[PDB]
Amino acid sequence: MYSEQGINNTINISTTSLTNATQLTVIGNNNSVYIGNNCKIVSSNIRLKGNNITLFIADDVEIMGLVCSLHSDCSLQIQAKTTMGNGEITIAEKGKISIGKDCMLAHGYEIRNTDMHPIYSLENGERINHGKDVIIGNHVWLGRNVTILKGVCIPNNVVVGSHTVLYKSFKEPNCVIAGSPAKIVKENIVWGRKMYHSTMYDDPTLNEFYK
Amino acid sequence: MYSEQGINNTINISTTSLTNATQLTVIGNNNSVYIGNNCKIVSSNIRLKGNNITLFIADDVEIMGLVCSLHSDCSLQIQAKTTMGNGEITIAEKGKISIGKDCMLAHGYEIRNTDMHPIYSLENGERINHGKDVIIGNHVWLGRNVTILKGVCIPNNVVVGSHTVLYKSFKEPNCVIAGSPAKIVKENIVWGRKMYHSTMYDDPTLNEFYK
Amino acid sequence: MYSEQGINNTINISTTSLTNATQLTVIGNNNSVYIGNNCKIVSSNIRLKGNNITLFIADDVEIMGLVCSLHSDCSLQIQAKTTMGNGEITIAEKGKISIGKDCMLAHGYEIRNTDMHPIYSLENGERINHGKDVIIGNHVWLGRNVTILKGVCIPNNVVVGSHTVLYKSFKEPNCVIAGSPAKIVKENIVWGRKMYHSTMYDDPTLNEFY
Ligand SMILES: CC(=O)SCCNC(=O)CCNC(=O)[C@@H](O)C(C)(C)COP(=O)(O)OP(=O)(O)OC[C@H]1O[C@@H](n2cnc3c(N)ncnc32)[C@H](O)[C@@H]1OP(=O)(O)O
Ligand SMILES: CC(=O)SCCNC(=O)CCNC(=O)[C@@H](O)C(C)(C)COP(=O)(O)OP(=O)(O)OC[C@H]1O[C@@H](n2cnc3c(N)ncnc32)[C@H](O)[C@@H]1OP(=O)(O)O
Ligand SMILES: CC(=O)SCCNC(=O)CCNC(=O)[C@@H](O)C(C)(C)COP(=O)(O)OP(=O)(O)OC[C@H]1O[C@@H](n2cnc3c(N)ncnc32)[C@H](O)[C@@H]1OP(=O)(O)O
């Protein structure tokens, strides 16, 4: 079902895209939803509740089983060619999560800019766990059941190992991050989608990563 | 919903509590199940197998999608105002697990006092993993997919970070616990449920924790 | 029962075995499934997609809620008396996974001989993460939500702690492995199934380990 309530809510979804079994809900005003061409956003549950919310999903994006919650003044951006399996994305506290071009997120991803509940200093009663944006660079591959906490920024051309929890940002591109505490465990690499290729040179989508 | 088999089983669920979609199975005798007032115990699967088992859920408890297995002479105690998402609790070896008041347990918790199977020392043939009680103090917030194993004691007003595993007791209240191995990672704090409270002083339920 | 489709597939499931609520799908050629006596393979979903794949399950194996995916020329063998709760097994790159006798695999296991996608070194463009066989020895106990990645070999009589991820093989038998990174955390032990025993000496299945 598609469902919309409020004023100046804009919703653009190409007729060349598939939204089978997906629920989209927009409640509030000046919210915008864009889904580009040749997308498959299936069996997903997407919920925008608040004001000035922006969901932008570029062309050739495939998402299956995404559970997504966005609150007022929040935005989610997902760039072209990115693929995503079952998972969860939560944005609150007027923040932003972005996901770069040609990412590959395996089932079980949990991504959030927020803890959803405040932690205060006993010293001065002040809140000290405020939301922080999440940026996942281009060509990032998340293995199964990876969790990305607030403020985490992930460099381009990175692979995150199965069941890793990221609570801190990294700077180094072209590497594998794994373990607990999450750490760079391999450098100078590039990942691809197709195991049938002999070398990186056989995959024309990787040219920009080795030069 | 409900299904019994045995005698002198005492089951009292307040008419003011909800058990929508919940299964209660009691197989055995002299068992008592107590569910207080204004409770919401939903989409759960609770079973007691054996004798003299104690399930006590105090008032103002909300539990959704709990799978719970209780064996002979075991007791589960959940104090008032506690909320719990999806998860599992397993109790055996006629042992004990209690959960304090105003706890907030996020989806994916796993809590157990037992390994369910023996491990013995080759050195002296003795068993070395006897079950041990779990004590979760007042006002504890478990992040997602937190695992709480046998004999673990958690102090009052503690936050456990997402995907942490706890195999050991902590004694310090007012702190955040995270990482592998789990350790105090922040000190002198207090958590609340509502973000829209700027400071702890704006939260009536936090009075006690600052003195 | 099962949905089989292609040329010369052989499915041999002992008449003494229960397959309640299990879906077995075979699509391809020259595939072979053997399930031995007194097995209970229930609520599982076993998919063989490709050619020359083999699945071998020995006697007295009990599996509940297994989601299994085998590709061409792959092989899964599960030895006698092994029990398995809900979990996932994935095999590709023409590799194999082998699970020993009398293992105990708790709910949430994930076992794979492949990453499903290539990683290349920038120094020469060559692939560095080829799939690698997984071998779980006899009498291995996986606790809850254990993940076993490619190439991993686990020794006999090992307990893996719950929520442990294994990315590397171990060589030492009779130990508890846990934590992150995964390490030997207790040596010189043996586990059993029934906790009603003063000592190991009261469990006859355990004699062979001392
Ligand atoms: C959409 C889809 O189809 S994807 C879904 C299915 N696939 C997956 O989930 C991916 C599974 N793979 C993994 O999680 C990881 O192994 C991947 C691919 C990041 C890494 O693969 P590889 O490049 O072969 O890494 P390889 O195992 O060498 O590991 C590299 C190093 O990190 C170390 N390491 C790997 N994981 C960990 C860990 N969890 N903790 C500590 N160290 C680790 C290894 O010991 C190794 O160290 P060493 O070189 O000093 O000996
Ligand atoms: C019931 C519900 O609705 S809950 C819904 C879902 N929400 C969640 O699961 C909450 C997610 N948050 C977390 O898991 C934790 O970070 C929290 C909330 C417990 C604590 O958050 P914060 O107070 O912001 O502290 P923060 O996460 O920055 O960590 C504090 C210190 O611990 C460190 N740390 C955090 N996680 C880890 C980790 N896994 N390993 C090692 N160190 C860690 C941080 O790096 C920081 O170190 P520093 O001394 O350099 O600052
Ligand atoms: C089919 C079925 O019925 S299975 C049912 C479900 N059961 C389970 O999932 C099993 C749950 N148990 C576990 O995951 C593990 O604790 C088991 C049993 C291997 C380990 O149990 P035990 O033998 O009692 O060992 P326990 O965890 O104390 O031992 C851990 C040791 O290494 C350390 N350790 C344990 N876990 C960790 C961890 N996650 N990270 C770091 N260190 C750890 C502990 O400190 C302890 O050593 P210490 O006392 O010197 O400090």
mmCIF file of N, CA and C in Angstrom, chain B residues 6-92:
data_model
loop_
_atom_site.group_PDB
_atom_site.id
_atom_site.type_symbol
_atom_site.label_atom_id
_atom_site.label_comp_id
_atom_site.label_asym_id
_atom_site.label_seq_id
_atom_site.Cartn_x
_atom_site.Cartn_y
_atom_site.Cartn_z
ATOM 1 N N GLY B 6 -1.560 -30.873 34.436
ATOM 2 C CA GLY B 6 -1.026 -30.982 35.790
ATOM 3 C C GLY B 6 -2.019 -30.460 36.801
ATOM 4 N N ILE B 7 -1.618 -30.427 38.065
ATOM 5 C CA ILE B 7 -2.523 -30.016 39.131
ATOM 6 C C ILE B 7 -1.874 -29.000 40.052
ATOM 7 N N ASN B 8 -2.694 -28.363 40.879
ATOM 8 C CA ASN B 8 -2.225 -27.301 41.762
ATOM 9 C C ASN B 8 -1.350 -26.297 41.003
ATOM 10 N N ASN B 9 -1.773 -25.982 39.785
ATOM 11 C CA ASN B 9 -1.153 -24.935 39.018
ATOM 12 C C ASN B 9 -1.974 -23.685 39.178
ATOM 13 N N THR B 10 -1.337 -22.608 39.605
ATOM 14 C CA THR B 10 -2.078 -21.390 39.879
ATOM 15 C C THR B 10 -1.690 -20.315 38.875
ATOM 16 N N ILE B 11 -2.663 -19.885 38.088
ATOM 17 C CA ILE B 11 -2.418 -18.925 37.033
ATOM 18 C C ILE B 11 -3.339 -17.726 37.170
ATOM 19 N N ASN B 12 -2.785 -16.581 37.530
ATOM 20 C CA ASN B 12 -3.610 -15.390 37.676
ATOM 21 C C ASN B 12 -3.090 -14.236 36.837
ATOM 22 N N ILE B 13 -3.828 -13.935 35.779
ATOM 23 C CA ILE B 13 -3.524 -12.843 34.892
ATOM 24 C C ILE B 13 -4.602 -11.781 35.100
ATOM 25 N N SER B 14 -4.193 -10.580 35.497
ATOM 26 C CA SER B 14 -5.146 -9.499 35.705
ATOM 27 C C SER B 14 -6.004 -9.319 34.463
ATOM 28 N N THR B 15 -7.288 -9.035 34.668
ATOM 29 C CA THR B 15 -8.205 -8.738 33.570
ATOM 30 C C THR B 15 -7.810 -7.449 32.869
ATOM 31 N N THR B 16 -6.898 -6.694 33.467
ATOM 32 C CA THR B 16 -6.514 -5.406 32.896
ATOM 33 C C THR B 16 -5.245 -5.515 32.051
ATOM 34 N N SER B 17 -4.670 -6.711 31.997
ATOM 35 C CA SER B 17 -3.478 -6.948 31.189
ATOM 36 C C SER B 17 -3.873 -7.581 29.865
ATOM 37 N N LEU B 18 -3.044 -7.384 28.839
ATOM 38 C CA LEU B 18 -3.291 -7.942 27.511
ATOM 39 C C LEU B 18 -2.296 -9.046 27.194
ATOM 40 N N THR B 19 -2.798 -10.134 26.631
ATOM 41 C CA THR B 19 -1.959 -11.258 26.279
ATOM 42 C C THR B 19 -2.199 -11.656 24.827
ATOM 43 N N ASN B 20 -2.742 -10.720 24.066
ATOM 44 C CA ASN B 20 -2.989 -10.914 22.651
ATOM 45 C C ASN B 20 -1.897 -11.733 21.961
ATOM 46 N N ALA B 21 -2.319 -12.790 21.269
ATOM 47 C CA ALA B 21 -1.439 -13.617 20.426
ATOM 48 C C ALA B 21 -0.397 -14.397 21.207
ATOM 49 N N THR B 22 -0.555 -14.471 22.518
ATOM 50 C CA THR B 22 0.447 -15.109 23.345
ATOM 51 C C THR B 22 0.042 -16.541 23.657
ATOM 52 N N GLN B 23 1.021 -17.429 23.706
ATOM 53 C CA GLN B 23 0.776 -18.797 24.114
ATOM 54 C C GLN B 23 1.361 -19.020 25.488
ATOM 55 N N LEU B 24 0.555 -19.595 26.371
ATOM 56 C CA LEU B 24 1.025 -19.994 27.690
ATOM 57 C C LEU B 24 0.849 -21.498 27.824
ATOM 58 N N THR B 25 1.965 -22.198 27.998
ATOM 59 C CA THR B 25 1.942 -23.632 28.200
ATOM 60 C C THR B 25 2.522 -24.014 29.556
ATOM 61 N N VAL B 26 1.717 -24.710 30.357
ATOM 62 C CA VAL B 26 2.168 -25.213 31.646
ATOM 63 C C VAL B 26 1.958 -26.723 31.741
ATOM 64 N N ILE B 27 3.066 -27.442 31.873
ATOM 65 C CA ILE B 27 3.067 -28.896 31.926
ATOM 66 C C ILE B 27 3.781 -29.314 33.192
ATOM 67 N N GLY B 28 3.025 -29.783 34.178
ATOM 68 C CA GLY B 28 3.591 -30.031 35.495
ATOM 69 C C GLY B 28 2.665 -29.573 36.598
ATOM 70 N N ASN B 29 3.196 -29.473 37.813
ATOM 71 C CA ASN B 29 2.354 -29.264 38.981
ATOM 72 C C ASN B 29 2.893 -28.219 39.962
ATOM 73 N N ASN B 30 1.994 -27.652 40.764
ATOM 74 C CA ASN B 30 2.369 -26.698 41.806
ATOM 75 C C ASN B 30 3.165 -25.562 41.210
ATOM 76 N N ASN B 31 2.748 -25.148 40.016
ATOM 77 C CA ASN B 31 3.362 -24.018 39.326
ATOM 78 C C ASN B 31 2.503 -22.771 39.494
ATOM 79 N N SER B 32 3.156 -21.619 39.553
ATOM 80 C CA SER B 32 2.420 -20.379 39.672
ATOM 81 C C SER B 32 2.865 -19.382 38.626
ATOM 82 N N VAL B 33 1.887 -18.831 37.922
ATOM 83 C CA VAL B 33 2.123 -17.775 36.962
ATOM 84 C C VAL B 33 1.367 -16.527 37.389
ATOM 85 N N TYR B 34 2.095 -15.442 37.631
ATOM 86 C CA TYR B 34 1.464 -14.181 38.002
ATOM 87 C C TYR B 34 1.820 -13.072 37.030
ATOM 88 N N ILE B 35 0.788 -12.442 36.488
ATOM 89 C CA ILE B 35 0.944 -11.317 35.592
ATOM 90 C C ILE B 35 0.102 -10.161 36.126
ATOM 91 N N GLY B 36 0.775 -9.078 36.513
ATOM 92 C CA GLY B 36 0.131 -7.946 37.178
ATOM 93 C C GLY B 36 -0.771 -7.107 36.292
ATOM 94 N N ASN B 37 -1.070 -5.895 36.750
ATOM 95 C CA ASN B 37 -2.032 -5.026 36.083
ATOM 96 C C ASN B 37 -1.388 -4.095 35.058
ATOM 97 N N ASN B 38 -2.164 -3.721 34.042
ATOM 98 C CA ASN B 38 -1.673 -2.885 32.949
ATOM 99 C C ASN B 38 -0.479 -3.476 32.238
ATOM 100 N N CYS B 39 -0.439 -4.799 32.152
ATOM 101 C CA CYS B 39 0.636 -5.472 31.451
ATOM 102 C C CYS B 39 0.219 -5.738 30.010
ATOM 103 N N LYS B 40 1.192 -5.704 29.109
ATOM 104 C CA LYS B 40 0.951 -6.095 27.730
ATOM 105 C C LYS B 40 1.939 -7.178 27.381
ATOM 106 N N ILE B 41 1.452 -8.403 27.303
ATOM 107 C CA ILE B 41 2.316 -9.531 27.004
ATOM 108 C C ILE B 41 1.849 -10.172 25.708
ATOM 109 N N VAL B 42 2.509 -9.773 24.628
ATOM 110 C CA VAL B 42 1.989 -9.947 23.286
ATOM 111 C C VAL B 42 2.931 -10.762 22.386
ATOM 112 N N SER B 43 2.332 -11.549 21.496
ATOM 113 C CA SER B 43 3.073 -12.329 20.500
ATOM 114 C C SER B 43 4.205 -13.112 21.138
ATOM 115 N N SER B 44 3.974 -13.603 22.345
ATOM 116 C CA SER B 44 5.012 -14.315 23.056
ATOM 117 C C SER B 44 4.706 -15.797 23.162
ATOM 118 N N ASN B 45 5.709 -16.546 23.585
ATOM 119 C CA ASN B 45 5.610 -17.978 23.661
ATOM 120 C C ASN B 45 6.283 -18.404 24.941
ATOM 121 N N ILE B 46 5.478 -18.664 25.960
ATOM 122 C CA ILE B 46 6.001 -18.933 27.284
ATOM 123 C C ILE B 46 5.681 -20.356 27.726
ATOM 124 N N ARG B 47 6.688 -21.102 28.128
ATOM 125 C CA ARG B 47 6.363 -22.409 28.611
ATOM 126 C C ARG B 47 7.108 -22.841 29.875
ATOM 127 N N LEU B 48 6.351 -23.507 30.736
ATOM 128 C CA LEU B 48 6.849 -24.005 31.999
ATOM 129 C C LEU B 48 6.694 -25.498 31.968
ATOM 130 N N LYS B 49 7.784 -26.214 32.187
ATOM 131 C CA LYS B 49 7.736 -27.658 32.180
ATOM 132 C C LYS B 49 8.360 -28.193 33.458
ATOM 133 N N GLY B 50 7.539 -28.790 34.313
ATOM 134 C CA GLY B 50 8.034 -29.323 35.576
ATOM 135 C C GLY B 50 7.236 -28.803 36.745
ATOM 136 N N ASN B 51 7.830 -28.880 37.932
ATOM 137 C CA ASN B 51 7.134 -28.546 39.173
ATOM 138 C C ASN B 51 7.738 -27.333 39.880
ATOM 139 N N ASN B 52 6.890 -26.615 40.615
ATOM 140 C CA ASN B 52 7.333 -25.545 41.506
ATOM 141 C C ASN B 52 8.048 -24.432 40.755
ATOM 142 N N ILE B 53 7.568 -24.145 39.554
ATOM 143 C CA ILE B 53 8.142 -23.090 38.751
ATOM 144 C C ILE B 53 7.435 -21.790 39.085
ATOM 145 N N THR B 54 8.183 -20.694 39.102
ATOM 146 C CA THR B 54 7.625 -19.405 39.461
ATOM 147 C C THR B 54 7.815 -18.404 38.346
ATOM 148 N N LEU B 55 6.715 -17.958 37.749
ATOM 149 C CA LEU B 55 6.768 -16.857 36.794
ATOM 150 C C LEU B 55 5.995 -15.656 37.337
ATOM 151 N N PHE B 56 6.731 -14.608 37.676
ATOM 152 C CA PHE B 56 6.151 -13.406 38.242
ATOM 153 C C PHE B 56 6.463 -12.223 37.337
ATOM 154 N N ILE B 57 5.410 -11.641 36.768
ATOM 155 C CA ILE B 57 5.526 -10.409 36.000
ATOM 156 C C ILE B 57 4.723 -9.312 36.685
ATOM 157 N N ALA B 58 5.434 -8.341 37.248
ATOM 158 C CA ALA B 58 4.805 -7.285 38.029
ATOM 159 C C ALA B 58 4.015 -6.347 37.131
ATOM 160 N N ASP B 59 3.436 -5.316 37.737
ATOM 161 C CA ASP B 59 2.565 -4.405 37.013
ATOM 162 C C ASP B 59 3.324 -3.574 36.000
ATOM 163 N N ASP B 60 2.583 -3.026 35.044
ATOM 164 C CA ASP B 60 3.138 -2.065 34.112
ATOM 165 C C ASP B 60 4.319 -2.638 33.332
ATOM 166 N N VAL B 61 4.246 -3.928 33.024
ATOM 167 C CA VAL B 61 5.262 -4.560 32.182
ATOM 168 C C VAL B 61 4.725 -4.768 30.771
ATOM 169 N N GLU B 62 5.544 -4.435 29.782
ATOM 170 C CA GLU B 62 5.184 -4.633 28.383
ATOM 171 C C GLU B 62 6.235 -5.483 27.671
ATOM 172 N N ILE B 63 5.810 -6.648 27.193
ATOM 173 C CA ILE B 63 6.711 -7.612 26.569
ATOM 174 C C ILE B 63 6.150 -8.010 25.229
ATOM 175 N N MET B 64 6.977 -7.957 24.193
ATOM 176 C CA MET B 64 6.511 -8.321 22.866
ATOM 177 C C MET B 64 7.437 -9.304 22.158
ATOM 178 N N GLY B 65 6.919 -10.503 21.909
ATOM 179 C CA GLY B 65 7.665 -11.520 21.172
ATOM 180 C C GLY B 65 8.753 -12.165 22.005
ATOM 181 N N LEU B 66 8.449 -12.434 23.268
ATOM 182 C CA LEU B 66 9.365 -13.154 24.132
ATOM 183 C C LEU B 66 9.157 -14.649 23.929
ATOM 184 N N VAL B 67 10.245 -15.387 23.778
ATOM 185 C CA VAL B 67 10.185 -16.834 23.812
ATOM 186 C C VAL B 67 10.814 -17.212 25.140
ATOM 187 N N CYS B 68 10.064 -17.918 25.970
ATOM 188 C CA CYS B 68 10.528 -18.159 27.324
ATOM 189 C C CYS B 68 10.336 -19.605 27.707
ATOM 190 N N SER B 69 11.406 -20.247 28.158
ATOM 191 C CA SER B 69 11.335 -21.635 28.582
ATOM 192 C C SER B 69 11.736 -21.748 30.049
ATOM 193 N N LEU B 70 10.839 -22.282 30.868
ATOM 194 C CA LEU B 70 11.138 -22.480 32.286
ATOM 195 C C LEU B 70 11.033 -23.955 32.653
ATOM 196 N N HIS B 71 12.076 -24.462 33.300
ATOM 197 C CA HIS B 71 12.109 -25.837 33.768
ATOM 198 C C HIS B 71 11.846 -25.947 35.269
ATOM 199 N N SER B 72 11.954 -27.163 35.789
ATOM 200 C CA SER B 72 11.505 -27.458 37.137
ATOM 201 C C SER B 72 12.211 -26.588 38.180
ATOM 202 N N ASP B 73 11.430 -26.096 39.142
ATOM 203 C CA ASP B 73 11.936 -25.311 40.276
ATOM 204 C C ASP B 73 12.642 -24.023 39.877
ATOM 205 N N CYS B 74 12.301 -23.499 38.710
ATOM 206 C CA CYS B 74 12.915 -22.267 38.236
ATOM 207 C C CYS B 74 11.981 -21.103 38.478
ATOM 208 N N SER B 75 12.536 -19.898 38.550
ATOM 209 C CA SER B 75 11.685 -18.721 38.656
ATOM 210 C C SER B 75 12.202 -17.539 37.845
ATOM 211 N N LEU B 76 11.258 -16.891 37.178
ATOM 212 C CA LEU B 76 11.525 -15.704 36.412
ATOM 213 C C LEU B 76 10.781 -14.579 37.097
ATOM 214 N N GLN B 77 11.499 -13.516 37.435
ATOM 215 C CA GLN B 77 10.891 -12.357 38.069
ATOM 216 C C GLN B 77 11.229 -11.096 37.288
ATOM 217 N N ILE B 78 10.184 -10.417 36.841
ATOM 218 C CA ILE B 78 10.317 -9.204 36.075
ATOM 219 C C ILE B 78 9.579 -8.091 36.801
ATOM 220 N N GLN B 79 10.333 -7.144 37.351
ATOM 221 C CA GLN B 79 9.754 -6.050 38.111
ATOM 222 C C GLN B 79 9.055 -5.008 37.219
ATOM 223 N N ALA B 80 8.459 -4.013 37.865
ATOM 224 C CA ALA B 80 7.399 -3.214 37.263
ATOM 225 C C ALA B 80 7.898 -2.106 36.341
ATOM 226 N N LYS B 81 7.131 -1.832 35.291
ATOM 227 C CA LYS B 81 7.446 -0.730 34.400
ATOM 228 C C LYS B 81 8.513 -1.160 33.398
ATOM 229 N N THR B 82 8.879 -2.431 33.428
ATOM 230 C CA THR B 82 9.879 -2.927 32.501
ATOM 231 C C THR B 82 9.261 -3.174 31.135
ATOM 232 N N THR B 83 10.016 -2.823 30.094
ATOM 233 C CA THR B 83 9.601 -3.037 28.714
ATOM 234 C C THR B 83 10.595 -3.980 28.061
ATOM 235 N N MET B 84 10.107 -4.881 27.224
ATOM 236 C CA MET B 84 10.989 -5.798 26.537
ATOM 237 C C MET B 84 10.502 -6.024 25.117
ATOM 238 N N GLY B 85 11.429 -5.972 24.166
ATOM 239 C CA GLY B 85 11.134 -6.333 22.785
ATOM 240 C C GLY B 85 11.280 -7.832 22.570
ATOM 241 N N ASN B 86 11.615 -8.218 21.344
ATOM 242 C CA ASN B 86 11.815 -9.618 20.996
ATOM 243 C C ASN B 86 13.047 -10.187 21.654
ATOM 244 N N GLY B 87 12.940 -11.424 22.118
ATOM 245 C CA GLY B 87 14.063 -12.058 22.773
ATOM 246 C C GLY B 87 13.736 -13.400 23.369
ATOM 247 N N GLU B 88 14.727 -13.969 24.039
ATOM 248 C CA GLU B 88 14.612 -15.299 24.587
ATOM 249 C C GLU B 88 15.186 -15.273 25.972
ATOM 250 N N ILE B 89 14.516 -15.978 26.872
ATOM 251 C CA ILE B 89 15.021 -16.210 28.210
ATOM 252 C C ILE B 89 14.921 -17.710 28.461
ATOM 253 N N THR B 90 16.011 -18.326 28.909
ATOM 254 C CA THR B 90 15.987 -19.752 29.214
ATOM 255 C C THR B 90 16.472 -20.004 30.647
ATOM 256 N N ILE B 91 15.686 -20.735 31.426
ATOM 257 C CA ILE B 91 16.073 -21.018 32.799
ATOM 258 C C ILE B 91 15.995 -22.510 33.103
ATOM 259 N N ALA B 92 17.057 -23.053 33.672
ATOM 260 C CA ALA B 92 17.068 -24.452 34.055
ATOM 261 C C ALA B 92 17.974 -24.613 35.244
#
